[PDB]
Symmetry: D2
Subunit: 263 residues, 4 copies
């Protein structure tokens, strides 16, 4: 099956930022033809730790910027929703509607996404056990979703820390396609006080682990200059490093693929 | 004064709310030093299963809670799940409750704060005690003046929650602290530990306790495994008041 | 039943330190006659994080110092053993043989302690679930132990942190008398790099919780000047604060006692 | 070269050790680029139950391991539980193993280091990756020169272990790292995850893998639920060598 790579800047800092990242993602989609790329960027960071942190320029602006990316580069689009009313307008541009981790159990949000006819990707809550995602998928199927993804993004491990239990990949595979979030899984929740931290040095090794275990795609936030990012400045991957990372996981996926267990 | 938030988990019917409300009113008259607040959700918006009981809607719920307040003169509290619900709920709710999974949703907090009502935020199972400082700041920014933080357990491995009592004194630095005695013992995805842990909460020191109670928990449509039998409420309240009376002498300052 | 208070300096820094603490503990035993005091101090810190940290002055010296305390103040004694061969010599002075947390599953150590005829107190391992202590008690009974205690001292919660799950008290009570370790439960394992950390501000509130829930005794390390201690300098209670703490828990225990559940 | 430590969990009989040893010798000849080390415990000193299988004693065990080394020319490794055992075990053991629960027992580490043999310390389930730096220092202080640290899971709630693969690169800063593929999936107080996680270990990067194997795990007297069927060992070794070959290109320096 075609491997999915969901990538883009964490937040829609500006339409300009999007086109800059989109251009590179488009270049890679032409090179890695065996990969299905989906451009990701949040029109709103509705769950920042601090009231003073950057949120975004609004739904309207965001959808417009994302539409420009799709129009200019012919790339599929994905963005996350935070309340039920956002599903409809977002569905006009998003090929995949993303459900935030903290909201993976909010029935109406899932239902709103499902009835749009678009694919739905649910970030597994940091509080959820792998087997608890079966009911999440059930809700989505009940709501009409035909293409469902479950994203591993770490689990609460003590305070301000997340651990990735790779046993989750084969477990969740029982009921949906699985995506590994390489950038949020290394973040340190509320690790900086008013903001969350992260350990960039672990992004690559853990993504290698994900493809060796086996998944249907990877999710990576990337920014031309992470240090200047307005969100997840500590975990976004420098855009120049994206190509090498993707080549690496495709290579590891290929050699490991013959050993992937049948669910 | 010490806060006691009690009531049936879900508004299964205003009939149920009236039966539970009568007992709470009674206790209310017996324990004058305690401020009682009637709680019940008009919607269980986060059930694990799509086939589980959610409720009868916001309108029916607000109406039923209206009945309780008017008929018994008891303050009211219920939780909201999306921003638009804040205003209509604030019509009857003296305290707007923010769900644990939603404790970081900025717009929900701001929406609640804007109503002018008191706001009680359930501490997310993924949150550290010190991470709640930012939660309080959001509410203050939104105009909230009466802010509560509720301890309801922290993720401890899979399908289990642990109560780290160190959280009470930490959260007390920036808000009044409430201990949720019934959800803290639930196994995500029990009853025998409700009383022991509530005794610990008052021994450590908190500003109030949250307890879901139902005439027949066995038949409850929500949290059947952890809702306290109505008939046992009086005894537990008396017990925690006695422990608090003695222990309060040692509560640390700030 | 008579409430147990196990207290003393973490390590036997010197026979002088012991007599200084013993004197105060003796004074309190005369005041709190409803309490059974047991003087505690390790002749060896055999599991320090760093090879450079203080361990002790040897078994011989330690037993001699502990014997002096028992002889001079008529106090019961408890100390921990680390290898099977230490059970016999230690049993000559120790009324209660303590089994370290990391070693709570070492069959031969438990058996060695049990056959001495002395009481045995096992620190619950940071890796053990409350219900897993049933087999620990079974081993001890199998080995001849007639008086057994299980001590709650925290559970691994993420890295370098411990949490106290008070549900452990009523669970362990099903098969043994339960003791709450007020000082090790707030320590931060390896929190200082070459040594462990601790948060003294939580010792009192958590001990209040322990007696409200209900236990058969408490364990507290105390030192005339904690800041100068050679071990657990961050968690040992200042000796001057001991009396007030004990009075407080007896008061809370009394008022809460009528509500203690029957096992 | 890449290390592969394999063998039956417990020395149920030297007969068993010989059967497993023959297969390991065979693989040894087929995978010349891999350094095989035969492992088996002469005593399960930390079983949960007093009624569970422990072993036939140190003497019988050392004799059986002697047989394996002499008959197949395979290096040997076994664990010790008390200081006095280091010397006699070092007679046959090329690598002395330190149990996870005992990774902080200074005298056991020093005793092992004094023998002059290599020392492999199982990382305690209560230990953080960076906490192992001190463990290595103790061994170096004791004269140890060949030191290994083994990842075998970390306490994650009750009766469960999680493998935090971030540990591999962290521990690599001060010692060679081994990944225990069979104990990492055990539930304290399963099998389907052994292969997936071992693939991850080599994709991330480690200096070797530890795998308990038995002709008929179902009948094993120890770790029956997690011991790998002998017949599946070859396939898994070939698989991890292939993944390592490709992934090694990306292993981070130090
Ligand atoms: O991904 C979710 C959050 O927005 C995340 O923790 C980053 O936000 P913060 O830096 O405001 O905590
Ligand atoms: O209680 C056990 C230890 O000795 C504890 O962690 C304190 O030792 P450290 O400061 O050497 O880690």
């Amino acid at each position: 099956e075609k491997f999915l790579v969901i990538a883009g800047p964490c937040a829609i800092e500006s339409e300009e930022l999007l086109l800059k990242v989109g251009e590179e993602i488009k270049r890679l989609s032409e090179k890695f033809k065996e990969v299905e790329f989906v451009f990701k960027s949040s029109f709103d960071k509705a769950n920042r730790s601090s009231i003073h942190s950057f949120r975004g320029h609004g739904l309207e602006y965001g959808v417009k910027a994302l539409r420009k990316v799709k129009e200019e580069f012919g790339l599929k689009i994905t963005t996350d929703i935070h309340e039920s009313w956002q599903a409809e307008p977002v569905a006009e541009v998003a090929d995949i509607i993303q459900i935030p981790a903290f909201l993976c159990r909010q029935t109406d949000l899932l239902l709103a996404a499902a009835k749009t006819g678009r694919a739905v990707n649910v970030k597994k809550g940091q509080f959820l056990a792998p087997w608890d995602t079966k009911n999440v998928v059930e809700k989505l199927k009940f709501g009409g979703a035909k293409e469902i993804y479950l994203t591993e993004r770490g689990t609460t491990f003590g305070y301000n820390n997340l651990v990735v239990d790779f046993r989750s990949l084969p477990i969740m595979k029982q009921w949906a396609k699985v995506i590994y979030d390489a950038t949020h899984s290394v973040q340190l929740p509320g690790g900086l006080g008013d903001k969350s931290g992260g350990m960039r040095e672990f992004i690559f090794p853990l993504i290698r682990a994900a493809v060796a275990v086996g998944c249907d795609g990877v999710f990576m936030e990337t920014h031309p200059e992470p240090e200047k990012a307005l969100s997840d400045a500590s975990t976004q991957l420098p855009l120049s490093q994206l190509e090498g990372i993707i080549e690496a996981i495709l290579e590891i996926r290929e050699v490991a693929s013959k050993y992937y267990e049948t669910i």
